[PDB]
Design a protein around this ligand. Structure first.
Ligand SMILES: [K+]
Ligand SMILES: [K+]
Ligand SMILES: [K+]
Ligand SMILES: [K+]
Ligand SMILES: [K+]
Ligand SMILES: [K+]
Ligand SMILES: [K+]
Ligand SMILES: [K+]
Ligand SMILES: [K+]
Ligand SMILES: [K+]
Ligand SMILES: [Mg+2]
Ligand SMILES: [Mg+2]
Length: 1316
RNA sequence: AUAACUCAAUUUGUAAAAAAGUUUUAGAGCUAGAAAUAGCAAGUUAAAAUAAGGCUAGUCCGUUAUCAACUUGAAAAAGUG
DNA sequence: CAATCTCATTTTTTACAAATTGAGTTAT
DNA sequence: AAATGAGATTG
């Protein structure tokens, strides 16, 4: 009747337990339903729910967005064919028909098999003339002869079907012609500005060096290499870098203490440059114009590779170039191999599986695997010297459709499209009339802020229609309301003001919002001088002066400025003490200065009659990021500023939204005062009151006005939490588990509920170092190349994050010496349990940090500080890591800070865990007392994993996860015991552990020793522990430790695997070649995979038991069957719509509809000798038994795998090994039934008896994946690998016992499937 | 424990785009020889599909979340030891 | 039939909002 | 980025 619940919440598991007064877990009889022998069964109230991980919405999103791209790319083609339809009907009757049936085999085609012209002779002639589609592109662009309308279409459709990216705004007009003159012009102006010293043009071939196919870095090096007395870091070097598209830094050139780095493709270039030019003088302007002018002709040299005077199609020409070089070097490679390597010619040019040229063209061999495979052959032969040059440039034998085309801007494909239309519109009138439309098909792009063009049936769409019409690319601006749509894009996601829920939050950069932040900070600033007795607030007149003089002149306001530029200058204090702010004010009037630079009118920003306009301008600048719409929205104010000011305001853009509403900060008014919140922050007289105070002061009316403005389900609520969907899945299951236990306990609520919650990309790592190293100017990657997969090594990863340098000592490290170095916790592990890179460092020896009990010492901080700064700016360390490193210069860890960490080790602060406790508390405590305050009948306790974990080590209740899943349940039992014991012993700690509403050393010691009441001797305490005030019993060393052992020793624990209908993709995505088989699924209704190939390995949503008849033999005599049919995800909707018809089509007859049993994945069946199986599929099974190993063996394995008194227990009881093997064998021979594997285990074990007991025990732990629950898996015992033994027949299940389990497993209905 | 602000890191969710990959077909293979089979010539490109499909017919929707059994329900979830 | 081997779509860009953690300032 | 449900091939 009196019980508490323990809960262990994980991403894949929820353990649960029920305990009584004396920490015993009850044992109850439960009714068994079904048609079986048993009418009931006894179960212990300890168990654990297992389940597959909850997934994010990401993959579904990526598939959904890809979906929409494919359909819109198709609509592009359709739009184009609709423009061509009438005039093509006169040239070729069925052209567009042959194109769309091009995929069909000749047997299924309506028209002749050759798509373009419809006859061998003309089709063979076409490929002779245009071996690639780019041969046709170029000719159609450059030639002036009338072209076949079918060839015009193909050219435009190819350009429209693959249009390139949209990452560059505006238009490009390739000009590769003037690089030599433009470079000479840059060197020219530079030498005009630096007359003391010039650069020499020197006939340097800039075109070749800068247009060569290397990275921008190399082309820079080669360029300055040809310049004597110059360096790549020097001014001219950093200019060449910018002209190449790089981001250089110019501060060290001009003696600037402020970083000046420019990127010509970044939208902030013009203003960044303005800052630089305002600092260094505008006589340097022409120097950057030359860099930009050279940048325009060199921009796309990466892709063009051709002079733009021969053609208007430098891309296609570049493509044709790839082809011709592929041709020559292929002829040349063939000859060579014949002469010098004839015996290898077959492998290279014929065998499709070898990654040769045949594998390259006809196989699945990528450019990289081809090059890798043919690298030795070339450098082995002679006469191949230039092919190796082409290979290192990745230019050897190149296709035209390649992974690296992603750099091509759509503006290029547009150029060629435009040219083709210009030539042939002379001959075809309709191409003239529709020249606009066609270009628009390639050009148009749904703006990301419009979203899907739905009509009321899209859960993802927000866009609004300016008129009810079909949206096309040509009527988009007129039919779609872009302004209202761009608004909803933001507003459907923005927060309302929690204080005023009917009001939108202000932009973060709103002038009003920043006045609020400055005053709210200023109003609690206090000051003292010599004369005065107390520190005093700032008055109204003082703040206004501080704002007008400092905040409206300085971007940031330092305390030094406050003391010198206000207190000294205006109040004549040689010295003053400031409280309430440190070093400088956090708040600032940034937008005030942003606009001051643009509108150059200070009296405009200070004029209060402009407040509304300025607030609407900054709202516009935040809501919209499309500068074409910003301009349209600022037009109304175009009369208040000149043209150039509006131009600048266009580009001013903000992001972010505040926490509060305009009405809250200003709108609302105090009835007595008539002042708004901001009025009080400006002037409140003597008491200078916070926003917090203003909102909670019962003397003012703000609180009541707010309070009267305020205003679901378990599943929606949990889904709306912030956190991993995986952990949310466990949260929901935890509530459902508790509901059932309460019901099991007769609807009596627990006394306590104790809950505990548990806590990979190499590409990101490689990206981190590449960026930081590049930003750091270090050669460590050229000197010590790396591969992402290597960086999963902890020490190697740090080594590169620290630029191959000791983090504490200022000396190099040796990659070959990592094993001799130390990983060290910045803030010692004994305080903060932090495993991440943020708290870790690689140093030669951990002794050099300093004292072990603290942050790295002052000495080290001094020596290394500047070096950590560089790592910070290179983003190789985070601010968190940096601030921790330096803390010693702030006194290191104070005694208070230490005590803080130790209690954070046992007291849970995580928000997600607090939500779990609040959910439980609100479901358990629903009643209110006579004073209308909540009655807390159930106390919800939350514990960190450390308490039970330490409890296990201390008292040797050891845990080994690999043996079975019982530990999930044991942890929950131990949570309830410990959690109830603590609150029973220290009822004052209710505030810390229970949900609801000099000394530092004592705090440290106290929390550090909190768990000693369990022990008899601490390095003494009575055998019977009790609480002081009540005298009640909490812990009894005599009987209670034994009860825990009895519980952890129980063989029967309810480990339930949640059955789940499988969802997601229909099958694997790969499209297999045609095959004579019924395994392949058609990719389209009429595409028989025997002809067209298709998908394999469909996914079973659930299995169904069918008992029915099937026809057999020539005569179709009916045989009675009972079998498992897998319903695939794709078939499921049809099956549930009409189950009989579905099964009848499948061949089953006279189906017994009332015996149809739906069997999701992991359905449980028992067989002979308690042997169990779980349904993995319609044709596979998983292991359904848990092996309960005696505690004595579990504790042994733990101690053997890893004081003198426990080492002796290992040797004394060494015979346990053979007994553990015995235990596994009987289990295996009884439930696993893998005969061969069990031998190789017994054989592989017999052979390593000679090995140490440690290693032997370490690998016996491996042996348990043979007996573990669920899917079989391979494992290694020393160097012997055991292959997994799958169970790929489900026949035996059909006569076994089906077990339907409730969430706890306590309620079962068992069906004996001996029915026919 | 809460609230606003500062700096930073992380996580979740959404939209708009790009390049490949795959699959069938089209790129008249040629001499020999009855036949397999040999010898050589070739290869780089394109079309089309890219969850089967759905009705609400939109340039929309189709892979997340949620699911023991029985009784009740569209469903959520409730009722049953 | 088992045993044994084999295989699994990938990558890139832009724009945006909300939590949460954790070092700070001020407050209820 | 596994791992785990199948496919084909073998014994
Ligand atoms: K035909
Ligand atoms: K290939
Ligand atoms: K291709
Ligand atoms: K500060
Ligand atoms: K914006
Ligand atoms: K004007
Ligand atoms: K699901
Ligand atoms: K799934
Ligand atoms: K994101
Ligand atoms: K279940
Ligand atoms: Mg489709
Ligand atoms: Mg392709």
């Amino acid at each position: 009747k009196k019980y508490s619940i323990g809960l262990a919440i994980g991403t894949n598991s929820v353990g649960w337990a029920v305990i009584t007064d004396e920490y015993k877990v009850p044992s109850k009889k439960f009714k068994v339903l079904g048609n079986t022998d048993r009418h009931s069964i006894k179960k212990n109230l300890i168990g654990a729910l297992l389940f597959d991980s909850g997934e994010t919405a990401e993959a579904t999103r990526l598939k959904r967005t890809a979906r929409r791209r494919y359909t819109r790319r198709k609509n592009r083609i359709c739009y184009l064919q609709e423009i061509f339809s009438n005039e093509m009907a006169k040239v070729d009757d069925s052209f567009f028909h042959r194109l769309e049936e091009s995929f069909l085999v000749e047997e299924d085609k309506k028209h002749e098999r050759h798509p373009i012209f419809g006859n061998i002779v003309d089709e063979v002639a076409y490929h002779e003339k245009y071996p690639t589609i780019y041969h046709l592109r170029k000719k159609l662009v450059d030639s002036t002869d009338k072209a076949d309308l079918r060839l015009i279409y193909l050219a435009l459709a190819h350009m429209i079907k693959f249009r390139g990216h949209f990452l560059i705004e505006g238009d490009l007009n390739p000009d590769n012609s003037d690089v030599d003159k433009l470079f000479i012009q840059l060197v020219q102006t530079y030498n005009q500005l630096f007359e003391e010293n010039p650069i020499n043009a020197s006939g340097v071939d800039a075109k070749a060096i800068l247009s060569a196919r290397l990275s921008k870095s190399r082309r820079l090096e080669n360029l300055i290499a040809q310049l004597p007395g110059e360096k790549k870091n020097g001014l001219f070097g950093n200019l060449i870098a910018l002209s190449l598209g790089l981001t250089p830094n110019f501060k060290s050139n001009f003696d600037l203490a402020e970083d000046a780095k420019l990127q010509l493709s970044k939208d902030t270039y013009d203003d960044d440059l303005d800052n630089l030019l305002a600092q260094i003088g505008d006589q340097y302007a022409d120097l950057f114009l030359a860099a930009k002018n050279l940048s325009d002709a060199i921009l796309l040299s990466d892709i063009l590779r051709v002079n733009t005077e021969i053609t208007k199609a430098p891309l296609s020409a570049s493509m044709i170039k790839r082809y011709d070089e592929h041709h020559q070097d292929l002829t040349l490679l063939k000859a060579l191999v014949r002469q010098q390597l004839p015996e290898k010619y077959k492998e290279i040019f014929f065998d499709q599986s070898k990654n040769g040229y045949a594998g390259y063209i006809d196989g699945g061999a990528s450019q990289e695997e081809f090059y890798k495979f043919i690298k030795p052959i070339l450098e082995k032969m002679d006469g191949t010297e230039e092919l190796l040059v082409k290979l290192n440039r990745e230019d050897l034998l190149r296709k035209q459709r390649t992974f690296d085309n992603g750099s091509i801007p759509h503006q290029i494909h547009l150029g060629e499209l435009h040219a083709i239309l210009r030539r042939q519109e002379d001959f075809y009138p309709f191409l003239k009339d529709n020249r606009e439309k066609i270009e628009k098909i390639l050009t148009f792009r749904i703006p990301y802020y419009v979203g899907p063009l739905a009509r009321g049936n899209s859960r993802f769409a927000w866009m609004t229609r300016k008129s009810e019409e079909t949206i096309t690319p040509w009527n988009f601006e007129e039919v779609v309301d872009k302004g209202a749509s761009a608004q909803s894009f933001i507003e459907r996601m923005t927060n309302f003001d929690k204080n005023l829920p009917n009001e939108k939050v202000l932009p973060k950069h709103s002038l009003l919002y920043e006045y609020f932040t400055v005053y709210n900070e200023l109003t609690k600033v206090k000051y003292v001088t010599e004369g005065m007795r107390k520190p005093a607030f700032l008055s109204g007149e003082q703040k206004k002066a501080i704002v007008d003089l400092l905040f409206k002149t300085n971007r940031k306001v330092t305390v030094k400025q406050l003391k010198e530029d206000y207190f000294k200058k205006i109040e004549c204090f040689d010295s003053v003490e400031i409280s309430g702010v440190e070093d400088r004010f956090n708040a600032s009037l940034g937008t005030y200065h942003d606009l001051l630079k643009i509108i150059k009118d200070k009296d405009f920003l200070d004029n209060e009659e402009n407040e509304d306009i300025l607030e609407d301008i900054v709202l516009t600048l935040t809501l919209f990021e499309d500068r074409e719409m910003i301009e349209e929205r600022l037009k109304t104010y175009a009369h208040l500023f000149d043209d150039k000011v509006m131009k600048q305001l266009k580009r001013r853009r903000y992001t972010g939204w505040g926490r509060l509403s305009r009405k809250l900060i200003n709108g609302i008014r105090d009835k007595q005062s008539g002042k708004t919140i901001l009025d009080f922050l400006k002037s409140d007289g003597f008491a200078n009151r916070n926003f917090m105070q203003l909102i909670h002061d019962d003397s003012l009316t703000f609180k009541e006005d707010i309070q009267k403005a305020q205003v679901d389900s378990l599943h929606e609520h949990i889904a709306n939490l912030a956190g991993s969907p995986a952990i949310k899945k466990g949260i929901l299951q935890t509530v459902k588990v508790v509901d059932e236990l309460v019901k099991v306990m007769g609807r009596h609520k627990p006394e306590n509920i104790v809950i505990e919650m548990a806590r990979k990309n190499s590409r990101e790592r490689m990206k981190r170092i590449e960026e930081g190293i590049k930003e750091l100017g270090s050669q460590i990657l050229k000197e010590h190349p790396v591969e992402n997969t290597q960086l999963q090594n902890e020490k190697l990863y740090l080594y590169y994050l620290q630029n191959g340098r000791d983090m504490y000592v200022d000396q190099e490290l040796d990659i070959n010496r990592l094993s001799d170095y130390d990983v060290d916790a910045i803030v010692p592990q004994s305080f903060l349990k932090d495993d991440s890179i943020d708290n870790k460092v690689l140093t030669r020896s951990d002794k050099n940090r300093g004292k072990s009990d603290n942050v790295p010492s002052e000495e080290v901080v001094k020596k290394m500080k500047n070096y950590w700064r560089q790592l910070l700016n290179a983003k190789l360390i985070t601010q968190r890591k940096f601030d921790n490193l330096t803390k010693a210069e702030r006194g290191g860890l104070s005694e208070l800070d230490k005590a803080g960490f130790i209690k954070r080790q046992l007291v849970e602060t995580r928000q997600i865990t607090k939500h779990v406790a609040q959910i439980l508390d609100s479901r358990m405590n629903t009643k209110y007392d006579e004073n209308d305050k909540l009655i807390r009948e159930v106390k919800v306790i939350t514990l960190k994993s450390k308490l039970v974990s330490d409890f296990r080590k201390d008292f040797q209740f050891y845990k080994v996860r690999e043996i079975n899943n019982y530990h999930h349940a044991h942890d929950a039992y131990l949570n309830a015991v410990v959690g109830t014991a603590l609150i029973k012993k220290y009822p004052k700690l209710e505030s810390e552990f229970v949900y609801g509403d000099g000394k530092a050393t004592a705090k440290y010691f106290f929390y550090s020793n909190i768990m000693n009441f369990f022990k008899t001797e601490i390095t003494k305490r009575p055998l019977i522990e009790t609480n002081g005030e009540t005298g009640e019993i909490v812990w009894d060393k005599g009987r209670d430790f034994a009860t825990v052992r009895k519980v952890l020793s129980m063989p029967q624990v309810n480990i339930v695997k949640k059955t789940e209908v499988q969802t997601g993709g229909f099958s694997k995505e790969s499209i297999l070649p045609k095959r004579n088989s019924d395994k392949l699924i058609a990719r389209k209704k009429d595409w028989d995979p025997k002809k067209y190939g298709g998908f394999e390995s469909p996914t079973v949503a659930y299995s169904v038991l069918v008992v029915a008849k099937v026809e057999k033999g020539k005569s179709k005599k009916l045989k009675s069957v009972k079998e498992l049919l897998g319903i695939t995800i794709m078939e499921r909707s049809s099956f549930e719509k009409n189950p009989i018809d579905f099964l009848e089509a499948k061949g089953y007859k006279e189906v017994k509809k009332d015996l149809i049993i739906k069997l999701p994945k992991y359905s449980l069946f028992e067989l002979e000798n308690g042997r169990k199986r779980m349904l993995a599929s319609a044709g596979e099974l998983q292991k359904g038994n848990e092996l309960a190993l005696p505690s004595k063996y579990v504790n042994f394995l733990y101690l053997a795998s890893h004081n003198e008194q426990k080492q002796l227990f290992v040797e004394q009881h060494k015979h346990y090994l053979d007994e553990i093997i015995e235990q596994i064998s009987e289990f295996s021979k009884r439930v696993i039934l893998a005969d061969a594997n069990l031998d190789k285990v017994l054989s592989a074990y017999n052979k390593h008896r000679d090995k140490p007991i440690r290693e032997q025990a370490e690998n016996i732990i491996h042996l348990f994946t043979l007996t573990n629950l669920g899917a079989p898996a391979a494992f290694k015992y020393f160097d012997t690998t055991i292959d997994r033994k799958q169970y790929r027949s489900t026949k035996e299940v059909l006569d076994a016992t089906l077990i339907h389990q409730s969430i706890t497993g306590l309620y079962e209905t068992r069906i004996d499937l001996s029915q026919l």
